[PDB]
Amino acid sequence: LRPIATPYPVKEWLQPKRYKAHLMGTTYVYDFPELFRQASSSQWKNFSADVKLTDDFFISNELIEDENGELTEVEREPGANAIGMVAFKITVKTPEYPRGRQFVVVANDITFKIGSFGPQEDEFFNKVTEYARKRGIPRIYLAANSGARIGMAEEIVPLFQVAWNDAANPDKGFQYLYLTSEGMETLKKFDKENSVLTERTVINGEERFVIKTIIGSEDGLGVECLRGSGLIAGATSRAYHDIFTITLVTCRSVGIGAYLVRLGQRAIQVEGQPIILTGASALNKVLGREVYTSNLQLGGTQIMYNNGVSHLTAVDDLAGVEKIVEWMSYVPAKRNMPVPILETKDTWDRPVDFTPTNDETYDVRWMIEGRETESGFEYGLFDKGSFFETLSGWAKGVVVGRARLGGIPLGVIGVETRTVENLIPADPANPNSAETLIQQAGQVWFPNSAFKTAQAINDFNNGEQLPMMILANWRGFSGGQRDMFNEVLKYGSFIVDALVDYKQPIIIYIPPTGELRGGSWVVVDPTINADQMEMYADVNARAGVLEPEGTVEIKFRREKLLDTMNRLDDKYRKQLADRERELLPIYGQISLQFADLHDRSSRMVAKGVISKELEWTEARRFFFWRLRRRLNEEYLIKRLSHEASRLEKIARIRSWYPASVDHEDDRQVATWIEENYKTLDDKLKGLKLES
Amino acid sequence: LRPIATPYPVKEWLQPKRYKAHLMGTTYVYDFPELFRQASSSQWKNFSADVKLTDDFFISNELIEDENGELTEVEREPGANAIGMVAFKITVKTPEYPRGRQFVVVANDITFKIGSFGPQEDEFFNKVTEYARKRGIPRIYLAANSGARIGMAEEIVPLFQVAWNDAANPDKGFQYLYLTSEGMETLKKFDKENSVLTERTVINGEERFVIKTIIGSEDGLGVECLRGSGLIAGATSRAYHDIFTITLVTCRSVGIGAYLVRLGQRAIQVEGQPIILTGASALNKVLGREVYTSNLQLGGTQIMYNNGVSHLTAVDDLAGVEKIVEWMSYVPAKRNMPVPILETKDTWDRPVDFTPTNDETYDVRWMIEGRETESGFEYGLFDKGSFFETLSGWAKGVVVGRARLGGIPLGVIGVETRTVENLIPADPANPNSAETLIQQAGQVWFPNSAFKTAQAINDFNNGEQLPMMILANWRGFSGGQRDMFNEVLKYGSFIVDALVDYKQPIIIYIPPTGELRGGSWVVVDPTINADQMEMYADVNARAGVLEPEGTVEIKFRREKLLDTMNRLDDKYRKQLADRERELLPIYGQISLQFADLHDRSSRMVAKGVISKELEWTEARRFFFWRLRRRLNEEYLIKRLSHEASRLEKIARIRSWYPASVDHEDDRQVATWIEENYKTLDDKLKGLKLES
Ligand SMILES: Cc1cc(C(=O)N2CCC3(CC2)CN(C(=O)OC(C)(C)C)C3)cc2cn[nH]c12
Ligand SMILES: Cc1cc(C(=O)N2CCC3(CC2)CN(C(=O)OC(C)(C)C)C3)cc2cn[nH]c12
């Protein structure tokens, strides 16, 4: 025992495995539920400081497989795990779910066989994933591993013989490896008969049993670990489309561990903990040369957070847990449950303070969450303090995160107007490679920002099951050679595919000072998914096939300009070229304003390509009731689905509204539905007996 | 008329639009059905030279919208199209479908308003896509366009007035644009009243109608073209998952046209025809400098074929059509129809001649399709002349194409063992940018090859609805810094996602000289999709978590080596370090062979991670009956699905087999099912009345 004379018992001594985990730079597996309790408790303090919490607000039960291989809840002492994979079912009362919400936490035990994945770990992880999926509850994975378990048939090591070319000279080589009849008998004695595949021969009176295949008696040596790896890869891929999946990389994550991080999609990387495929030393051995210095050079946050593999970084394990808990606060308690409403001090009924200007540079986050000024706080479109940005280290041209609109959680996509630089590090394997700095213009989709946009759309849809708002402000895609070669078309197409798959309401809003041109409009038009999408343009937004300069270049040419001087200029109506030379600068501007007068929200309304033109200051009030109304109608459409189109379903639901309700008034419709949920339920139940 | 005195009529004069299309370097739209007839006729000649074709073997009917907007077949003279989008329903008797197969061909008319997409073109394209989808038939798109239609309100051009700052000095600027009461009256006269949005004011007795928004009387000017663009983007995204989709880029393809190429996925690019987003000239205007020289520098085959955007290139339009027709020959006639069997001279019953060797370099295509040698033709695994390679210009480390196995069409994925170089061109926008040459090791998945593998899997599954074979031979993924930074994990994960979605039989086969290690095995294990996947290893293949060198480094260390000399070496059993120094080279090799003896197909069978170990020479005979048996059982499983698991369904089907049939004999099972299809149908019909 060390240290001696401590006020309370030494936990690292009571359970020596706690100390091993600490030595390896991570939280001991059985101490993670405590971090969840701490993080959950902080969630309450930051929400309502006055709240009194008892310990019944949080329950953690370890899940273990029974005799029949069925998962069951147990209360046992930490460190009694027979396998290197552990799980807990957590029930927590949270501000969003005061009566309680559940989730499963699966974790590798880094103290058990270096946190390697053997077949039993692989089968348990899969069983826990299925348990979560069946229940529709979130699956949190805590990665601290060494990848697939590696081994050799240790019993064949002290028994094998080598059939030398020349017994006297071993350096002359060998023909094969074999067993003596004494060796075979050792195996027959210990029942490990099937540990080898032998072909018997006779060489100089001696009977040799030639080793044709070494199998081993111990399970978890090779290909059986790889089968399990593939099994848990498939399971995680499936879970991502079914439940909320998140991973915290808490110590290193290797091989299958790295793939699991990615297949679960949403990931938080603790600083200094690498996500690697093959270690740096092994790569150097393969390369001959000493190319790489460390594993963090390969999979640190400097790589993975900049890649977009890691959605967020965390200073330590508790910060990682706090981030999980915060992310979860926007997510339904279980699959197909409503999005968790959480109204705070910042209510729906207020105008939007922060307003962008054409003449002044801004951070889109100010339009989202507001900004601190010397003269007080300027409120943005969403609730103060509700913006939770993710994928912040990658493709910084698009801003993605979760927010709240009068308590309603949703995913937000905004456009960074400022030029963005990214540093491509120098390739250690190429001596003629130097670090490159890429600069990307604002309001233009590039391969990385198009990929991030599509990724965001998918991560909001799958598991999170959230509505979304896109503050659409793009000039188009980078049409240049480098970006065309870097497959900008491929990533742009993923955006369309993500919108087609979207199952919750979408609001596309061209904000003030915002634009949407040819290429950018195509990829975000509400006709991509009419069932879920609707578009709105601010009165101070612009949209058209080309930018005005482009339109004038194709349709307001010199002949048309001169015919305009020959109409508007008295003096003009070699004596001409002197007049032309003085008028062209202003007559250029006149055509440029003529083109711009077509690019207005009023044209968009006239042509019926947008639902409404809006005033930025009044957007929060409008979107709160439009979103609330939309969630209520969507609920009614889902209930009716228990064989008709959406158009027929919504017509039927709206035929139930009193004759006096204006179908175009969002507040009235939302208010009526909420006042009549049980009445509407009775109606629905009456229709069920009619099918 | 020119030329004069030709033997037959001058078609380019009879229809002047034919000449315009030719001048622009493309086939005239109405002449494409003829290219399909020519290509289809060649298909027959290359199959059976003796066949006699009449003109009834091929029918092409133009599809046009009727009064109610419903598509109908018409016989009219070319060039009578009121819109710039045309379609044909083609019915062709082919070697695979001698009684006929159908498909729709949609094409832009480059002679109609430069092949721009206006709302009517967008609505027609969408109607044709829906027509194809409803019928389950392939949709061929021929791209020859200028993107979304651009325009201005031409009627407001001769009427607008400018409200100058100083009437005498125009160069001093202006305040707004306006209309006179005479201008307003011109609009009122021609009914174009709603062409402008005006706000009336009085300035110096004069009544000015200030232009607040220019709308226009003509449809197809701006945002209405963008709405249609998004509509056809969504439709194509959807079609790709539903029917066989292919695009031939026959003249330039711009903006929405470029996205359509990509959303349809499968594309053939005619040499010299660019796929661009923004033209080179417009980019230069935006850039200030003269950065780009041509549109082919941005979207030529040098870009798109090297990207993998273009699956194939074609010398001219007929070569493009021939490639469509050849690709289609592997595809079912309509959605959910069986894969088209086409038995040729090269029958199933033969061994595989071409065999790879460890000591000798080979082209994987020889293992696939065979090779010509001086001593005659060495047959490969698949039918002679059946390999149709696609994505040949991109990520040349993986070989992807369609082939036939005794007539059965399937998708093939093979590993290029040779080192692959690719040339990244120099960025014209960066003066400090020089062309880079990347070299990639064989048998290693890199970001591009992992992406190509996933892409291949998806393109075989969607629309093509084919079974697949992967000749799995990878050491793993590139774990190095450059490839980790270039998101190798992301692309590796797409492989898993593609396999999870696979709906047809899959065969994973580790070939002779082939390997599958830690990282590579995870992503292709049959437990990712147990319902469709099965794995096989050649007797001369290897598999384990690490390569032998890796295994020895972790589990056969110095203490273990010395304990082996202290057991096997009489002389060994400062007098030691001299012995150690002489024995370590051979004792290294002994441990290296000890590790390798675990990496065998016999271990794979023992541990039950593979279905069977195989002999390469006998693989064609085995896979032909295994695949045939699998297609028959899959058919029966689909019929039974008209509420149980797959395991229950296949148990039921196999309970119908006579007691004497061996469920493990593929040939016997396939033979019995094919002899009893109608008998099994009767059984199925009897069960229907029991639900
Ligand atoms: C002057 C002018 C403009 C546009 C237009 O509408 N653009 C918007 C889309 C872009 C291109 C200009 C901006 N994007 C771009 O790559 O910008 C980078 C900053 C290079 C990354 C593509 C069309 C035309 C046609 N003729 N003259 C035009
Ligand atoms: C010697 C040795 C080998 C392996 C092994 O199994 N590898 C297979 C997978 C690779 C890495 C070596 C090959 N890949 C690679 O990047 O190869 C490039 C050519 C660089 C592109 C990753 C593991 C270990 C562990 N200790 N010592 C090892």
Do A268 and A341 fall into the same domain?
A: no
Do B193 and B89 fall into the same domain?
A: no
Is B281 within 8 Å of A460 (Cβ atoms)? no
* Burial tier of A50 (Cβ tally within 10 Å: 0-12, 13-18, 19+): exposed
A149 marked as binding residue: yes
Closest CA to A320 of A369, A280, A270, A362: A270
Largest Cα separation within chain A, whole Å, is 122
Is A364 within 8 Å of A399 (Cβ atoms)? yes
The answer to whether B598 contacts A214, with C-beta atoms less than 8 Å apart, is yes
Is B28 within 8 Å of B77 (Cβ atoms)? no
Residues listed for chain B: 691
CB-based contacts of A521: which residues, under 8 Å, 6+ apart?
A543, B223, B226, B229, B230
Q: What is the CATH number of the domain that holds A171?
A: 2.40.460.10
Amino acid in position A292: Y
Produce one character per residue of A453-472: b if its CB has 16 or more CB atoms within 10 Å, e if not: bbbbbbbbbbbbbbbbbbbb
Do A215 and A307 fall into the same domain?
A: no
Choose the final residue of a domain: A305, A320, A335.
A335
Chain A residue whose CA is closest to B521: A226
The answer to whether A226 contacts B285, with C-beta atoms less than 8 Å apart, is no
Cβ–ligand 2 distance for B563 under 6 Å, the answer no
Rounded distance from Cα B278 to ligand 1 centre (Å): 7
CB atoms within 10 A of CB A377: 13
The minimal CB distance from A213 to the residues B223, B496, B600 is found for B600
| End-to-end Cα, chain B, rounded Å | 73
A–B CB contacts, 8 A cutoff, strictly below: 406
Do A84 and A163 fall into the same domain?
A: no
A169-179/A161-166 β-pairing: antiparallel
The minimal CB distance from A525 to the residues B226, B487, B544 is found for B226
Q: Which residues on adjacent β-strands are paired with residue B378?
A: B371
Question: What φ, ψ does residue B85 adopt, rounded to 5°?
Answer: -135, 130
Amino acid in position B345: K
The conformation of residue A148, written as its DSSP 8-state character, comes to B
CB atoms within 10 A of CB A655: 7
Calculate how close chain A gets to B288, using CA atoms only, in Å.
13
Residues 422-441 of B with CB under 8 A from A: 424-425, 427-430
Question: Given CB atoms, is B479 within the 8 Å cutoff of chain A?
Answer: yes
The conformation of residue A194, written as its DSSP 8-state character, comes to G
The answer to whether B479 contacts A223, with C-beta atoms less than 8 Å apart, is no
Q: Which domain holds residue A382?
A: 336-691
The answer to whether B223 contacts A521, with C-beta atoms less than 8 Å apart, is yes
**Helix A317-328 with A32-45: angle, nearest 10 deg:** 60
Residues of chain A contacting B147 with CB distance shorter than 8 Å: 518, 545
The structure tokens listed for A324 are 């999980």
Q: How far apart are CA B19 and CA B489, in angstroms?
A: 52
Closest CA to A629 of A666, A661, A579, A676: A666
**Helix A256-263 with B488-501: angle, nearest 10 deg:** 70
The structure tokens listed for A534 are 């609707």
Q: How far apart are CA A679 and CA A639, in angstroms?
A: 13
The answer, yes or no, to whether the previous bond of B447 is cis (omega within 30 of 0) is no
Any idea which ligand is nearest the CA of A222? 2
The answer to whether A609 contacts B564, with C-beta atoms less than 8 Å apart, is no
Ligand 1: residue whose CA is nearest its atom 3: A550
B420-424/B436-440 β-pairing: antiparallel
The atom number, within ligand 1, closest to the CA of B283 reads 11
Chain A residue whose CA is closest to B595: A152
B58-65/A468-470 β-pairing: unpaired
Do B524 and B481 fall into the same domain?
A: yes
Closest CA to B217 of B185, B194, B183, B184: B194
The answer to whether A609 contacts B223, with C-beta atoms less than 8 Å apart, is yes
Cβ–ligand 1 distance for A279 under 6 Å, the answer no
Calculate how close chain B gets to A424, using CA atoms only, in Å.
8
Q: How far apart are CA B678 and CA B675, in angstroms?
A: 8
DSSP readout, B222-257? Answer: SHHHHHHHHHHHHHHHHHHTTS-EEEEE-S-EETHH
What value, to the nearest 5°, has the Cα angle with vertex A189 and ends A188 and A194? 30
Ligand 2: residue whose CA is nearest its atom 16: B478
The conformation of residue A579, written as its DSSP 8-state character, comes to H
Report, in angstroms and rounded to the nearest whole number, the Rg of chain B calculated over CA atoms.
32
- Residue identified by tokens 């609001």 is A507
Is B228 within 8 Å of B118 (Cβ atoms)? yes
- Residue identified by tokens 């509204």 is A657
The minimal CB distance from A298 to the residues B285, B484, B529 is found for B484
Calculate how close chain B gets to A172, using CA atoms only, in Å.
8
Cβ–ligand 1 distance for A476 under 6 Å, the answer yes
Rounded distance from Cα B286 to ligand 1 centre (Å): 6
The minimal CB distance from B222 to the residues A485, A489, A544 is found for A544
B2 marked as binding residue: no
Do B353 and B343 fall into the same domain?
A: yes
Q: How far apart are CA B247 and CA B320, in angstroms?
A: 10
C-beta pairs of A322-326 under 8 Å, 24+ apart in sequence: A322/A39, A322/A42, A323/A268, A324/A39, A324/A140, A324/A246, A324/A248, A324/A268, A325/A36, A325/A39, A325/A40, A325/A43, A326/A43, A326/A388
Closest CA to B84 of B113, B55, B57: B113
The structure tokens listed for B65 are 């919208």
Distances (CA, A) of B578 to A165, A197, B581, B583: 22, 36, 5, 9
Q: How far apart are CA B514 and CA B492, in angstroms?
A: 20
Question: What φ, ψ does residue B230 adopt, rounded to 5°?
Answer: -60, -35
A101-108/A85-92 β-pairing: antiparallel
The minimal CB distance from A153 to the residues B171, B279, B598 is found for B598
Report, in angstroms and rounded to the nearest whole number, the Rg of chain A calculated over CA atoms.
32
The structure tokens listed for A507 are 């609001």
CB-based contacts of B484: which residues, under 8 Å, 6+ apart?
A276, A277, A298, A299, A303, A307, B478
Is A474 within 8 Å of A517 (Cβ atoms)? yes
The structure tokens listed for A603 are 């044209």
Any idea which ligand is nearest the CA of A443? 1
Question: Given CB atoms, is B605 within the 8 Å cutoff of chain A?
Answer: no
The conformation of residue A585, written as its DSSP 8-state character, comes to H
The answer to whether B551 contacts A276, with C-beta atoms less than 8 Å apart, is no
Amino acid in position B314: A
Choose the final residue of a domain: A335, A360, A388.
A335
Is A160 within 8 Å of A177 (Cβ atoms)? yes
Q: Breaks in chain B, named by the residue before each, with C–N above 2.5 Å? A: 573, 642
Question: What φ, ψ does residue A202 adopt, rounded to 5°?
Answer: -120, 120
What value, to the nearest 5°, has the Cα angle with vertex B518 and ends B517 and B520? 65
B93 marked as binding residue: no
Residues of chain B contacting A277 with CB distance shorter than 8 Å: 476-479, 484, 488-489, 519
Do A282 and A431 fall into the same domain?
A: no
- Three-class SS state of B74: strand
Do A570 and A655 fall into the same domain?
A: yes
Distances (CA, A) of A207 to A184, A198, A392, B476: 11, 12, 68, 41
Q: What is the CATH number of the domain that holds A661?
A: 3.90.226.10
Cβ–ligand 2 distance for B542 under 6 Å, the answer no
Ligand 1: residue whose CA is nearest its atom 2: A550
Question: What φ, ψ does residue A15 adopt, rounded to 5°?
Answer: -125, 95
Cβ–ligand 2 distance for A278 under 6 Å, the answer yes
Produce one character per residue of A635-646: b if its CB has 16 or more CB atoms within 10 Å, e if not: ebeebbeeeeee
Question: What φ, ψ does residue B101 adopt, rounded to 5°?
Answer: -140, 150
Please, how many CA atoms are within 13 Å of residue B357, restricted to the half-sphere of its CB?
A: 5
Q: How far apart are CA A334 and CA A96, in angstroms?
A: 13
Do A533 and A590 fall into the same domain?
A: yes
Is A106 within 8 Å of A32 (Cβ atoms)? no
Q: How far apart are CA B80 and CA B87, in angstroms?
A: 13
Segments of B383-429 assigned E as strands: 388-390, 398-405, 408-415, 420-424
Do A113 and A176 fall into the same domain?
A: no
Instruction: Give which of A435, A493, A573 to mutate to test B binding, by max B Cβ within 10 Å.
Output: A493
For B565-616, give the secondary structure using H, E and C: HHHHCCCCCCCCHHHHHHHHHHHHHHHHHHHHCCCCHHHHHHCCCCCEEECH
DSSP readout, A648-660? Answer: HHHHHHHHSS-TT
Give me the numbers of helices (H) and strands (E) for chain A, helices first please.
24, 29
- Residue identified by tokens 């009566």 is A99
Cβ–ligand 2 distance for B351 under 6 Å, the answer no
Could you give the number of structural domains in chain A?
3
Do A134 and A158 fall into the same domain?
A: no
Q: Is the alpha carbon torsion for A603, A607, A611, A612 positive or negative?
A: positive
Residues 169-228 of A with CB under 8 A from B: 170-171, 173-174, 177, 194, 197, 211-216, 221-228
Calculate how close chain A gets to B367, using CA atoms only, in Å.
25
Q: Which residues on adjacent β-strands are paired with residue B92?
A: B58, B101
For A480-537, give the secondary structure using H, E and C: CHHHHHCCHHHHHHHHHHHHHHCCCCEEEEECCCCEEEHHHHHCCCHHHHCCCEEEEE
Rounded distance from Cα A148 to ligand 2 centre (Å): 15
Choose the final residue of a domain: B171, B197, B219.
B219
Cβ–ligand 1 distance for A550 under 6 Å, the answer yes
Please report which residue ranges of A241-279 form alpha helices under DSSP H.
256-263
CA A12 to the chain's CA centroid: 36
Q: How far apart are CA A60 and CA A38, in angstroms?
A: 13
Is A471 within 8 Å of A367 (Cβ atoms)? yes
Residues of chain B contacting A173 with CB distance shorter than 8 Å: 586, 589
Rounded distance from Cα A446 to ligand 1 centre (Å): 13
Produce one character per residue of B260-270: b if its CB has 16 or more CB atoms within 10 Å, e if not: bbbbbbbbbbb
Question: Given CB atoms, is A535 within the 8 Å cutoff of chain B?
Answer: no
Do A331 and A394 fall into the same domain?
A: no
Question: Given CB atoms, is A162 within the 8 Å cutoff of chain B?
Answer: yes
Mutation pick for ligand 2 pocket among B488, B549, B555, B596 (CB with most ligand atoms within 8 Å) = B549
Mutation pick for ligand 1 pocket among A474, A485, A516, A549 (CB with most ligand atoms within 8 Å) = A549
The conformation of residue A240, written as its DSSP 8-state character, comes to H
CA B137 to the chain's CA centroid: 17
